[PDB]
Design a protein around this ligand. Structure first.
Ligand code: HEM
Ligand code: HEM
Ligand code: HEM
Ligand code: HEM
Ligand code: HEM
Ligand code: HEM
Ligand code: HEM
Ligand code: HEM
Ligand code: HEM
Ligand code: HEM
Ligand SMILES: *[C@@H]1O[C@H](CO[C@@H]2O[C@@H](C)[C@@H](O)[C@@H](O)[C@@H]2O)[C@@H](O)[C@H](O)[C@H]1NC(C)=O
Ligand SMILES: *[C@@H]1O[C@H](CO[C@@H]2O[C@@H](C)[C@@H](O)[C@@H](O)[C@@H]2O)[C@@H](O)[C@H](O)[C@H]1NC(C)=O
Ligand SMILES: [Ca+2]
Ligand SMILES: [Ca+2]
Ligand SMILES: [Ca+2]
Lengths: 144, 147, 146, 149, 146, 149, 144, 144, 147, 146
């Protein structure tokens, strides 16, 4: 599937519902990263500075806050190709010296998809649109 | 036209992707996808939009055209429960299309298939039967009198 | 005036006061009840849409087209190219009718009373005055909206 | 008391949600660019602090992406006003991001605080400047812990 | 202009929007919140009544005095002698403060949005515009309100 | 309009649930066998279309299992009237199952439609023939797309 | 445990509650097949024609509709040995040329059991009766 | 992290909420042991006498009742070092001839933590306090 | 002092770990952790509690002291919405501390940091801002007039 | 008397009747309304806390300290060492005031009426009589509470 103009609009609205205003964001981020470290417990080591051992701490919750904010910036820019590439390159530099594998980007990809679906319901979740447009995002964070 | 429960489903699914609190960029993004698809099913119809600079679908003139087309579609949807007013609204839209030379009723059939194709990619739980029950009476009322 | 912040403000308050469904028609009826009360002479200009009976399907259709035109123009407030193109399109439709520009002043007053009366006390009247001038200037070309 | 109360926290999130666009950067970009235009027109030497993100070219893609990051950071902090434990951690991370930059002081935050106080009523309905600044200052107090005056 | 019929309309719509009891305090707070949101620089003109904190007893007392002046002026709209005597009295209190008359234009905009937002869609904005001119002319003497 | 409306969809699922047995085939079998008895007594050459499932022996285990499959397919379609996207896919799968069979045309479905219109009021309470047929025809329209008249 | 006359009655009533009238059937079927492809992702390939890659599509939802209908026919026939064997043989021919392993039939077996339990509650779920009577069903679909 | 006096108080109150009065105890115990046997199906064999094959049976539900009661006694004694060691030694003798590995005690440890969190919410669950104080409990049941 | 919504949060989180249905053992367990931490930040202040046998923090005399300290803190928290009564309550607590020789206002600052450190380890979703907004006016009102 | 079972019983019923928040102050006011009604002469003993007006912040503060003292003493009922130490502390505070021990009898009666009136019919009066004797004995040392 392709992340076309229609899929970008659908992903935008579905993200806004799942991400919400701010009340469910702590639960939203917790659901995502509990899935990440369950599927890949070995990834916890890269999060030593933000208490990856304990995702219930305020230190990691702020990290999950920043990660979701990064996704929100990308999703809000899916209809703005020029500015989206600039912000994706900024995320790339934030992960450059961390050795994040392409396997892990897909793990977080799947957790984000399970989290949005868990937030808005399998009844409306558009898996093809979400998979194609998160590929565009993660592929930009890995340089290419 | 269509039943109140069907119209209720169409109106709620339409406001989901189109309302007053939606920036015009996504308005003409949907318009460009709709008309680009119409020109792939009926390439003969692209010549009819020369007055609004269809040669450049990124221009202000053509963006404004798709905006007012989608606004007319929104106006028809939001009056599905007012059959008397919808009749007058569609009669006015028919006169605005019958006067245009080169328009065939088959072009509105192709537009119907474009809407039935694009909207599920945008709408959650798109109901094609409720939309057919309401859009098809709209399509015929706008194409009433077209060759 | 009508800077980018006021344009967003106007889009915000418009979407709220405009609503969905049949409330849209109630807003439009209120707008046009105010226009004809502010200037009873303006009613005779709309015999082509049966203004003699504002409940008729003919005038309800006119109401819907007008407030739909406001909606699409307000929605394009943030894109000059599309906005001016649509305002020119509306100008070419209103020009042949030889309308006194003073009625577009009356339209604005009625629009402010209807939007603000529906939106509540946080209605930003200076922003609506400035941004309605942009709309009326595009439709009439009259520099009384300068 | 001038403290950011629970009541003021609710009011700020209301003032913010009624202006925030959850799907398109058009409203975020407009508010941010308008804030920095106000900041630069009041603090001329501040533009040189953003040489890396093309501060002189407010409509560049580089400064558009910076503006989106600033508003995203403020949006995360306003939301985290409901969870001050996590907020304190996020405000520390923002502090070190503004540290080790000569020219970034507590005086520039007092200036951008004025910038928001002039931009927000133009775009926000039912704007409460009192409740807004009490919690905006609470947010900047954590962002300027280890900064010069 | 503000003829006798417009004065009756304004008195009627004011009395409805103004209300009883604590509704007046809430009405007054919205009016002055709109004034300071329409023109934030006008806030510094009210340091004498502690405009730094709008919920302070000093500023709430000023709010009560202002909407009390609006209420008593509007009530006397139909007696020229008493009305002009009070406008002259209000003029003598504001004149030595060197106020820019443009702020009385901003005040009018906030008054219209507050009364209209409270009264609803049938708010008569042209009537309030013309009759507020009479008030602002009486207080400032500036022919900008002529 | 003769369209199967949302209202008619609710009524059909009510007419169907008040007769459907969720645990025992006794009621499903009775309705199905009664429908095909009515179909065979009105279309004599139709029995030869079901030679594989012992159409002439309505009480055989082979035709009992076929009757259960037909009513299960109608039950899935009636339920999927609430989700027409999935319904359109299920009605296509049913269409190809009735394709490549000479003798299975659009005329046999109009006949079995009459069979249901005579069986259903005998077993269903509060039966609405108008609302029933409008959505039954909607269902058969998808089942007879690529069939002869 | 044995799928006796009493266990067949209990499974019937518990299935009717979980399967319901039609409103929760889409969620019921989704819960089952999300469990199947999670425990055995390799099974997705056999579902190429019905979009096994994306169980949110209308194409797969109709397939899940047919699978649940097949279970409903079998459960409704558990008290009718003769007719049940006929319908089980019909299901066997529908899977004959597909190479379905005995491991997979148990995977779907477990997903169906988790789905019914998730629908009616662990407080009432009869695991022995469900395991013994689904064995009777799957064993008939595999020929023997 | 250390199971200090403050962590013992927090674990006490959080356990009392999750364990409750008696209404949700059947669901609480089921959630725990469904997690245990899912992460380690091989552990079912040690529970032959109490129907470890079927945790829905009244026989296993009574076993889960006894296990939770044992945890309740330990948690209620976390502020009483002398009496806690006595009861922990009693639990040790109850598991002495069963060959329970240190890996399994951590599996049940994690299930209990997931069960309490599932009962009281990730929003309040104190992972560090629970991990440190359950270590004190399990380490006493293993002798040392 | 502090707002009603802030006070509501402080009162509910406090009753969570301290109420009438709580045995005194956990009462002085919290008291011992609080005062032990105070003596690690300001070791000079331990001498001020010699009259209540601070040499043995397991004694009945010192357990009773921490009990009445936490009871006074509980009394202040439960009157956060009665500003007139809280003023008199804190003025009485101030007189009970100003009369004690060797007490500096900095010692109450250290106690504030001890409470801000210990309470999150005991309270679910500890709100440090609501607690700061209410405890700091309490701390200053009790330390009002201290050197 | 006042065995360990009665001490737990008293702690139970106290926590229920004492409540949380502002109900605590209503309980305390009721307790002291009963004391002064049972013995009007006792009111003059509390002029140092402004008993002349039981609604004053001075007497409301006294009420809070007293019922807070009951709460902490009842909470220590199960630890003799801390209990007696705090009762001695309360004794050293009440001794210099030269109080007639008959008022501590009045206090108990009012406490039983307030707790039982708030707790309902399951109030264990024998347990409260026995365990209040332990409290009054610790504060007064008078063997009339033996
Ligand atoms: C796929 C979308 C992702 C987004 C939107 C994202 C976003 C972010 C953001 C905004 C930060 C903050 C950086 C800073 O403030 O310095 C961050 C940090 C980090 N991210 Fe990601 N990230 C993504 C993927 C991943 C993945 C897949 C991994 C590893 C498996 C990862 C590992 C990290 C690490 C180790 C940090 C450092 C945090 C610290 O120690 O302070 N990221 N990420
Ligand atoms: C739901 C379907 C449609 C709706 C709601 C719709 C509505 C409208 C509206 C509101 C306008 C502008 C009227 C004005 O000038 O005020 C317009 C213009 C026009 N439409 Fe349609 N229309 C639809 C489908 C079609 C189709 C299928 C064709 C095929 C050729 C078509 C051809 C045109 C043309 C040629 C114009 C004039 C463009 C110009 O101004 O130069 N429309 N339509
Ligand atoms: C912002 C202000 C206005 C907007 C957005 C607006 C918009 C519209 C629209 C969309 C139409 C329908 C054109 C068509 O579909 O053929 C229309 C028609 C018309 N408008 Fe306006 N209008 C505005 C103000 C006015 C005013 C102030 C007057 C006169 C005092 C006026 C007089 C007319 C007339 C006479 C028609 C044609 C009625 C007919 O179809 O018979 N408009 N306008
Ligand atoms: C509420 C007020 C503010 C917020 C929420 C905020 C937030 C942010 C954020 C999120 C970043 C991105 C850092 C990164 O991605 O690594 C940033 C960068 C930066 N900020 Fe702020 N900021 C605020 C005020 C200020 C002020 C007043 C100044 C200077 C007077 C300033 C100076 C800078 C600089 C120099 C950078 C780095 C530029 C670059 O990375 O190219 N900030 N800020
Ligand atoms: C338009 C209708 C207005 C009315 C009916 C009104 C009424 C009043 C009244 C009754 C007072 C109290 C005078 C006294 O008792 O000493 C007052 C004071 C004052 N007014 Fe106005 N006012 C109006 C507009 C304005 C505006 C637009 C401004 C400035 C932007 C303004 C500036 C002031 C100031 C500075 C004071 C002195 C406050 C103090 O320190 O006592 N007034 N006004
Ligand atoms: C609402 C009406 C009908 C429904 C829901 C329906 C449904 C079904 C279903 C579910 C099957 C099973 C296919 C399989 O398991 O592979 C089937 C088989 C069949 N149907 Fe229908 N059917 C309907 C009407 C008809 C009619 C009117 C005819 C002929 C006039 C017909 C002819 C057949 C034949 C020949 C078979 C195959 C027999 C066999 O497999 O031995 N059906 N139908
Ligand atoms: C255990 C109970 C099962 C039931 C009741 C069941 C039922 C069904 C039904 C009714 C169909 C429709 C066949 C048709 O209409 O042509 C089908 C198709 C199919 N089934 Fe099953 N099935 C079961 C087990 C399985 C398992 C365990 C697998 C694989 C792991 C499987 C794989 C398939 C495949 C590949 C198809 C073909 C679908 C297509 O491509 O159109 N089935 N099943
Ligand atoms: C970690 C905290 C644990 C607690 C509080 C606990 C508690 C208990 C209790 C109270 C009994 C009842 C003994 C009796 O009445 O005779 C019991 C039995 C048993 N426990 Fe545990 N246990 C724990 C850990 C484990 C683990 C990790 C395993 C194995 C992986 C285990 C395996 C068993 C077995 C096999 C029995 C025998 C039950 C029977 O056959 O009657 N226990 N446990
Ligand atoms: C929230 C903080 C505090 C509260 C609520 C509080 C309250 C109290 C109370 C109720 C008493 C007993 C009064 C009586 O005898 O009836 C007391 C005693 C005392 N407090 Fe405080 N206090 C606090 C902090 C401090 C701090 C920081 C110090 C630092 C030195 C301190 C030093 C003392 C001393 C020396 C005594 C007397 C001990 C004795 O009786 O020998 N307190 N406090
Ligand atoms: C169980 C019974 C009682 C308890 C627990 C109790 C407790 C208290 C407490 C905690 C104080 C505050 C000491 C301080 O902070 O300085 C106090 C003060 C006082 N009590 Fe009692 N009390 C009891 C009975 C009585 C009775 C029966 C009387 C007299 C008839 C009495 C007379 C006083 C007086 C005069 C004060 C001092 C008022 C002042 O501060 O000016 N008490 N009591
Ligand atoms: C097509 O139009 C694009 C949009 O630019 C806007 O519209 C045109 C018509 C001009 O008015 C321009 O000033 C506006 O900004 C152009 O960017 C693009 O170059 C155009 N493409 C071609 C081939 O001319
Ligand atoms: C410290 O105090 C501990 C507590 O015992 C109780 O308090 C002491 C003061 C005596 O009154 C005793 O009878 C009480 O049971 C003692 O257990 C401990 O031994 C004391 N420590 C030292 C070093 O004396
Ligand atoms: Ca990927
Ligand atoms: Ca099996
Ligand atoms: Ca462990």
């Amino acid at each position: 599937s392709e992340c076309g103009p229609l899929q970008r609009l659908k992903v935008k609205r579905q993200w806004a519902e799942a991400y919400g205003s701010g009340n469910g964001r702590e639960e939203f981020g917790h659901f995502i990263w509990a899935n990440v470290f369950k599927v890949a417990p070995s990834a916890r080591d890269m999060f030593k500075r933000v208490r990856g051992d304990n995702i219930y701490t305020p230190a990691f919750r702020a990290h999950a806050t920043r990660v979701l904010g990064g996704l929100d910036m990308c999703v809000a820019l899916l209809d703005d190709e020029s500015v989206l590439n600039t912000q994706l390159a900024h995320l790339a530099s934030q992960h450059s010296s961390r050795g994040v594998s392409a396997e892990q980007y897909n793990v977080v990809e799947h957790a984000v998809m399970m989290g949005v679906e868990h937030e808005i319901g399998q009844n409306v979740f558009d898996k093809d649109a979400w998979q194609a447009c998160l590929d565009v995002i993660t592929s930009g964070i890995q340089g290419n | 036209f269509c039943s109140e429960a069907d119209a209720t489903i169409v109106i709620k699914q339409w406001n989901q992707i189109y309302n007053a609190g939606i920036g015009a960029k996504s308005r003409w993004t949907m318009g460009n996808e709709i008309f680009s698809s119409l020109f792939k099913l009926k390439p003969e119809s692209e010549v009819l939009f020369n007055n609004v600079n269809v040669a450049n679908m990124s221009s202000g003139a053509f963006h404004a055209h798709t905006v007012r087309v989608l606004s007319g579609l929104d106006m028809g949807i939001n009056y599905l429960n007012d059959a008397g007013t919808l009749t007058s609204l569609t009669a006015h839209l028919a006169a605005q299309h019958v006067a245009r030379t080169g328009l065939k009723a088959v072009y509105f059939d192709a537009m119907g298939k474009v809407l039935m194709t694009v909207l599920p990619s945008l709408i959650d739980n798109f109901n094609p039967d409720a939309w057919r029950n309401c859009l098809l009476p709209l399509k015929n009322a706008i194409a009433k009198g077209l060759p | 005036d009508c800077n980018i912040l006021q344009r967003l403000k106007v889009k915000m308050q418009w979407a709220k006061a405009y609503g969905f469904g049949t409330e849209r028609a109630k807003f439009g009826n209120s707008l046009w009840t105010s226009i004809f009360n502010y200037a009873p002479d303006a009613r005779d200009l709309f015999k082509s849409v049966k203004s003699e009976d504002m409940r008729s399907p003919q005038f309800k259709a006119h109401i819907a087209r007008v407030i739909g035109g406001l909606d699409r123009v307000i929605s394009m407030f943030d894109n000059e190219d599309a906005l001016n193109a649509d305002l020119e399109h509306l100008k070419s439709q209103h020009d042949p009718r030889g309308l006194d520009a003073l009625n577009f002043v009356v339209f604005g007053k009625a629009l402010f009373a209807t939007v603000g009366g529906q939106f509540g006390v946080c209605f930003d009247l200076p922003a609506w005055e400035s941004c309605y001038k942009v709309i009326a200037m595009g439709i009439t070309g009259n520099d009384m909206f300068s | 008391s001038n403290s950011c109360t629970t009541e003021d926290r609710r009011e700020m999130q209301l003032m913010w949600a009624n202006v925030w666009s959850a799907q398109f950067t058009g409203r975020r970009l407009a508010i941010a660019q308008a804030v920095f235009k106000d900041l630069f027109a009041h603090v001329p030497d501040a533009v040189g602090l953003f040489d890396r993100v093309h501060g002189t070219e407010i409509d560049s893609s580089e400064f558009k992406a910076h503006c989106i990051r600033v508003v995203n950071g403020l949006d995360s902090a306003i939301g985290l006003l409901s969870d001050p434990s996590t907020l304190n951690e996020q405000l520390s991370h923002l502090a070190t991001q503004h540290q080790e930059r000569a020219g970034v002081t507590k005086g520039g935050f007092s200036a951008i605080a004025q910038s928001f106080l002039r931009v927000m009523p133009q775009v926000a309905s039912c704007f409460n400047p009192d409740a807004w600044s009490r919690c905006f200052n609470r947010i900047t107090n954590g962002m300027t812990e280890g900064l010069a005056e």
